[PDB]
Design an enzyme around this catalytic site. Structure first.
Site, PDB file in Angstrom:
ATOM      1  N   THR C  84      -4.481  -9.831 -19.192  1.00 11.78           N
ATOM      2  CA  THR C  84      -3.516 -10.936 -18.728  1.00 11.78           C
ATOM      3  C   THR C  84      -3.386 -11.239 -17.247  1.00 11.78           C
ATOM      4  OG1 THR C  84      -2.350 -11.415 -20.962  1.00 11.78           O
ATOM      5  CG2 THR C  84      -1.933 -12.786 -19.579  1.00 11.78           C
ATOM      6  N   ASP C 376      -4.158   3.127 -23.495  1.00 16.12           N
ATOM      7  CA  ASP C 376      -4.106   1.944 -22.388  1.00 16.12           C
ATOM      8  C   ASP C 376      -2.765   2.871 -20.708  1.00 16.12           C
ATOM      9  OD1 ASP C 376      -4.731   0.295 -23.239  1.00 16.12           O
ATOM     10  OD2 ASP C 376      -2.865  -0.602 -23.638  1.00 16.12           O
TER      11      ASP C 376
END
Lengths: 510, 510, 510, 510
Positions: C84, C376
């Site tokens: 993002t 992640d």
């Protein structure tokens, strides 16, 4: 587009709709009950007295009605006819709860009441049980005569009851598990009911395998073969590789020898009648005929089973194990044509464990419903010998049952009283509906009979629908198996109990 | 055409819709809970008390509701019934967040609060845990009696609890991983619940393979075969090349010899009962019958597994390894017909590692829900022996839980206080909803019981719905497994936590 | 019907639309980021925090948005989460070019500026790089703790980081190419995150091949077979031609001998556990069971690979080459049921080159996103040991980066100044967006923190979102891998550079 | 396509549908009754408590429901509110007949029973009649206070009852035919109920005819003119034929003279206020203004009528007959603006034969329902002075009524007993429904209150819904006019009697 019902909405639908189903079938109850005509989507016509047939054939939409199929299906397995009796009471129980529900009586209270009513009814059921001669065939027949009511062939209950009860008494086993499916009901339209009869053995709907075989053999020696009478072929794939002209005849003749010798082995058993579940080679027929062996081909497995029960013969797989001691007996085996229909009859069996009732009659509907009537009587007679105890029928006992149920309501009290008393109130609908369908004033019958019936020791007083007045049910022999009233009535309520717990109906449209 | 929800829009939908699902099922909670009727697109009818069945059968559209399927599915694996309890609290938690969200309280604060509340609740859960006799069967049964509530067959909790707890105690293993799927629930409609019973062994829904075989064998010698009883065929392709007529009979007879000798080998094990997972050659049946061997064909693998658990018999692939020491034992193996349905019963097993509960009942719905009730009780009893610790149930403990949660809110303070206090406020909805569904003034019950309940050492004071007033839950035995309250309540919130993080819903219409 | 965009038209579309995608996902950034709910055409529900999942699942229409899929896909391969961050800056870069494009600043000048900015940023990236202990596990864990933010399971970062960093440290290879796909993430819904754990070995989602085999073996001798355990069949077509009856048994027994002896050879390896990638003959199961060999069938190739990494066992094709020295080791091999699901667990491996993290959790969405969170963290930790250098995170460093970028703009001058200064202006959007999503006045944070941050040697001063004020990021351990900031930010711009060259969009409608 | 109902079919429809209408409106009954929102086809919104409004506005389809419109319409003319009371009992009477009809009780017997019940109820009605002070205003007001229940403005019954009863006492005539339409209800939205007031005179919704006329005149001399104040034109057609220029002014001036002199004649009456039903010439306004005459134009005929009743002034057709002795009096005539709305107020009238109640309130719905409440109270007060006899209300007396109805059933006996007893059973639904709508256990209230109520001389014991328990209705002043209970209840049944005679419904679809 689908409709959704909650709370009162679901109550109104479930109660009204199930009641409507009951309102439809209520007319079918008892000696004075009438019949219904149902025609399916393909246009095929069914004439019925049977509630289960009515429910399973009718296009039932509401789930609550579909529930009755489950109950009636069980009722069929246990008691057979009279299911209308349970349905009608349940319909009133639905109405009685509606009235209490309109007062907002808690649904669980109604169910709580019915649970207590079931428990109290069990005690009352044990109390009303009349012990009777367990082996008295004639009185048993009298019960069977009552069993044959609510169909138009009770005019001939004389012969009919005799055959039905005799058939049951014939198959009596040490253990009660006696399965009435061990008594075969054979249907043949033609002629009228007058020609109906008991076959102490089995009727086989097959043709004589070879035209040249004996048409009648008295003291037959029965063999049961489930294997095809042909040149046997191996499970393993195999092929003949011919290298010389003479082999063509050697292998052809080898099959001739295998078949022929196999037949000699059949002959070596001493068998004079042979039943084959599978097929029979054309040449096999020839040799068997020359050997004087009467043959039946493609015999239905269930018929093979009844043949074993009748003759004592055992189904053999390997002819090599077939010996004379494996043969069964029959007083007469004969090829018969009835209404010009070739059939093979196994009659006069020595010690048959199964028997077959031949039903004659003018139409398919005649033989369907008469056959159904026979199955029904057979079931309730079976229950009657299964527990040698009975009660008066015709709605009379239910008065005595409600009589003390009212006493329980008074001894219990409170709101629970309402639930139990309402149950009791519904219990009286049976004689009430009989009276109405009998064309009589139901209030007159209920009030007047209740007055007489109550009277401590006046138990058997019920309604005589023929003269249309109160009468002692005992002397007229208007009675029912303890089992039928027991299972039907108690379960009728216990199934409703679940419906009463329903507060939300979410149903898609098919 | 598809709708798109962001921020408040998504909040309004998710909160209202999930709440609406809860509003639909909230009525099903507890001893006073009612039932629902769901009918699918094909018109098939389901009657249920079970939340998971309700969610998985209902045509759920909103994703947030679909989330509840995931939670309830896990709840099923751990605790079984009472999932409504978690759903209802979550619905209030959604409402409580709506109020805080209307103040614009940051979503992560609400979640942060619930995380702290979960951690504090874990401490409180360990604190409320009541240690009880780990092996006391009768008190365990008392717990099982409470477990059997919220269905209409608790009238018979006497026999039912006895069977269920006995069955669990029978399968107790050193290690807690005991899988309740090792206790078989066998359903047979017909008759009523009264005939339900415990089989210390296994009921097999199959028919006697050959009609001539023994119908009953007491001290049976059980063999388990998973291979078909036929002439064995090789994996490698093979073909017989016949060059002489006599070979036709030599190979046919070779298959007769291979089958027959193979059967002799079966006989050489000493086996008297044999279970075959696959098929059985017709001739095999003949010889086995002549050898006095009782056979079952096409036995379902899971039944083969329960047979091993009951008898001690081991499934053998190669008959050549089959010996008498491989045989298992059963006190009785018998062919039985129930409701006229032929089945093979393995009863009176010596040291069964699995058992089977036979359920009887009037309808399919009866036996489905009773069977479901048995699975439910069995799960919570299993948890109860898995950790020998319990708490009072009926919403009473949640008061004590909120009681100190309020203290934490006061010791924490600030905006976090709101989140935790709101959690606590929602925690009281359970007794509140019970009270409402019980028909009572929920404010009256909550205020008055809270006043009494709080009182330092008055922990067990809860609501008696039968008399409709405060009562000591302990003496009435209104209790629940520590595990059920633990996993259900904590997870209920932890799953909501993710929903609270949702600020954007983009969903296509199917 | 298709629309055609040229020059300004294409600019307005590309800039607005890509910006709109960014405006949609900007809310997902960082510790304070929120989540999204995406439901596909078939109605299946996905809950995500992941940008790549969002882009690849959302029905993206505009090509410029589809470009972001290519960038984010690469970002996934290198850095994992935080994409993002790049998207939002690019959105501002699009806005900043729009303003300059409205002045008609030449598109190649904007790109020329960004190229220079990328080169200068590379120097600045090397300058901000903080060298840290390459092998310090605990500080590495502290980095992992920051890595576990922006998901709701960071409450348990204590155990979670420990497992994740331990797992990475376990698989450290001399060469940095360490592929994190060598660490398996195993998902099992049920229970809660609390039960998550590290398995120093491999969990296999398969069932015990034969019920009679040992259920648990401590110091197992592992063999890996990729061939099916059956009677081997040749590649060349072949057929058996039988000419004598005894051959039927000779060939059947030959297959029995080939299988049995083949199993003896398996036994001759000494193997006690055997993994088969293909199937296992029923009889093979029998003999292997009698030989005390625990077997797993149809094992997924990637699981076969992890088994090799755990045990040291080598996959063997020909059993004839299988010897004891080919066997691998495991401290424990056991058959386990989790949530009642039979699985085969390979635990306590001696020197595992791969490990497996078992994730527990209440829903499928829980375990999907927690598993995603683990992937992640594992990626960024891998990068962190791949270059033992880090920078502060949280938007703080980007201030220092723009700080000197402004100096470059001043030293460069002219129109090029505008392009570079605009880049720098966009670089500050990150802390700006964090502040806004944190609910704070972004102008307040930017102005006040910028004032403090600049201050020559006050580098680590960033925003503490928990207390909502400026704070030293270093002591709070708010840091990021050098690699993540390096690759993500530089590439983010370099991909935009191509979009800026677009002056003609001719797109057909699907 | 139209449906046709006969016998039972018509019974099921008529009974269920009318019952459903009752089930809809039953909630509106009494002090605890709630309200309904009806919106028509054009979207206009009506909020109502009134049954007649509900029936006449609702789109009623079934004729049987349409019958209730006829009954309720009559109920409106006689008793006003409480029609729900009759509807609900009738609904039960329909249910009670359904039960008896299910027994096939002859429809004429049910009706025969209700006829006897009406006759016996008449005797009972005369018996329960309590004589009270015919002219006691304060106790009359107490009755009015009870009359003002079942609307939300009874909070102000203090002032409201005072105005309503005072207004009725003001219009008392020697003869009872007093028409309450002689008391005007004037509605003006704005402000709140607080500003409601009694005007001893009339409020006219018209504007001052000329702006220059006096705005207020104390002791006004009122003239009533129904003719237009213009140059009079003959009935016979006529035309002026002008032959000289001066005639133009002569005829113009002639009309000036006719108007002016006509006004002088108006002035010659001495009148100071003049009401014109028709219009007023512009010049007429000028001269009347110069003469100091206050004028109202286009006055609604019914207002002209109330003006006559207030002032004593007589409507004059020919001004030539108008003299001072024809003038009426008013203590004050004034032009007022209320909520900024110009109106002409005739107040403080000497001996008004009519009065006007000004109602203020926040919305149109407020003033509609408050005005409706005033009409309702006014009707029942009118009945109360029309026969100075009352009975207790609240369902209490109906217990005493059924109490002796049961005695009649016992003295009558037979099937007729059922009909009369069922009537009596239905008579108790009123307190039953009140109890349910009050949220209380209706069985508890009925049983317990019935026990206390019966008790020979304990007549007034009824239910206090505020404390939710039995209480002496007399001291609390819970009473109703003899007339209301008399006409409503008896007629309710007598109308049903016709519905019960319906055995054939043939209805076309509109």
């Amino acid at each position: 587009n689908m409709k959704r019902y909650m709370g009162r909405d679901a109550q109104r639908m479930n109660i009204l709709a199930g009641r409507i189903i009951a309102e439809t079938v209520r007319s079918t109850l008892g000696p004075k009950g009438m019949d219904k005509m149902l025609v399916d989507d393909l246009g095929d016509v069914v004439v019925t007295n049977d509630g289960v047939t009515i429910l399973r054939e009718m296009s039932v939409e509401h789930p609550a009605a579909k529930m009755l199929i489950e109950v009636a299906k069980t009722q069929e397995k246990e008691v057979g006819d009279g299911t209308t009796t349970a349905v009608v009471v349940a319909g009133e129980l639905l109405r009685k709860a509606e009235e209490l529900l309109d007062q907002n009586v808690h649904p669980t209270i109604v169910v709580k009441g019915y649970q207590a009513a079931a428990q109290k009814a069990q005690e009352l059921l044990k109390t009303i049980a009349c012990e009777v001669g367990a082996q008295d065939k004639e009185i048993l027949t009298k019960i069977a005569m009552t069993s044959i009511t609510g169909k138009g062939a009770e005019k001939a209950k004389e012969k009919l009851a005799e055959i039905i009860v005799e058939a049951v008494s014939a198959v009596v086993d040490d253990e009660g598990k006696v399965d009435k499916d061990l008594i075969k009901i054979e249907k043949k339209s033609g002629a009228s009911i007058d020609d109906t009869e008991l076959i102490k053995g089995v009727l086989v709907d097959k043709e004589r395998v070879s035209a040249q075989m004996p048409k009648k053999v008295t003291d037959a020696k029965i063999a049961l073969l489930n294997c095809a009478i042909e040149i046997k072929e191996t499970e393993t794939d195999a092929e003949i590789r011919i290298t010389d002209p003479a082999k063509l005849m050697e292998f052809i003749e080898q099959e001739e020898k295998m078949l022929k010798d196999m037949v000699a082995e059949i002959k070596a058993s001493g068998a004079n009648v042979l039943f084959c579940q599978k097929g029979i080679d054309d040449l096999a027929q020839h040799y068997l005929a020359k050997e004087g062996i009467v043959a039946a081909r493609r015999v239905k497995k269930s018929d093979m089973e009844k043949l074993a029960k009748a003759t004592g013969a055992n189904v053999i797989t390997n002819i090599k194990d077939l010996s004379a001691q494996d043969l069964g007996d029959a007083g007469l085996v004969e090829e018969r044509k009835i209404s010009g229909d070739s059939m093979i009859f196994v009659e006069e069996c020595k010690h048959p464990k199964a028997v077959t009732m031949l039903i004659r009659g003018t139409t398919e509907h005649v033989i369907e419903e008469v056959a159904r009537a026979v199955d029904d009587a057979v079931g309730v007679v079976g229950c009657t010998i299964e527990d040698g105890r009975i009660v008066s029928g015709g709605g009379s006992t239910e008065v005595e049952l409600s009589m003390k149920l009212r006493e329980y309501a008074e001894g219990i009290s409170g709101r629970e009283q309402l639930a139990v008393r309402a149950f009791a109130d519904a219990l009286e609908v049976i004689p009430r509906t009989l009276a109405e369908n009998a064309g009589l004033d139901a209030i007159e019958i209920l009030v007047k009979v209740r007055a007489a019936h109550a009277s401590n020791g006046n138990k058997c007083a019920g309604l005589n629908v023929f003269t249309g007045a109160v009468e002692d049910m005992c002397e007229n022999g208007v009675v029912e198996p303890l089992r039928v009233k027991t299972q039907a009535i108690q379960s009728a309520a216990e199934s409703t109990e679940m419906l009463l717990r329903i507060d939300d109906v979410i149903a898609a449209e098919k």
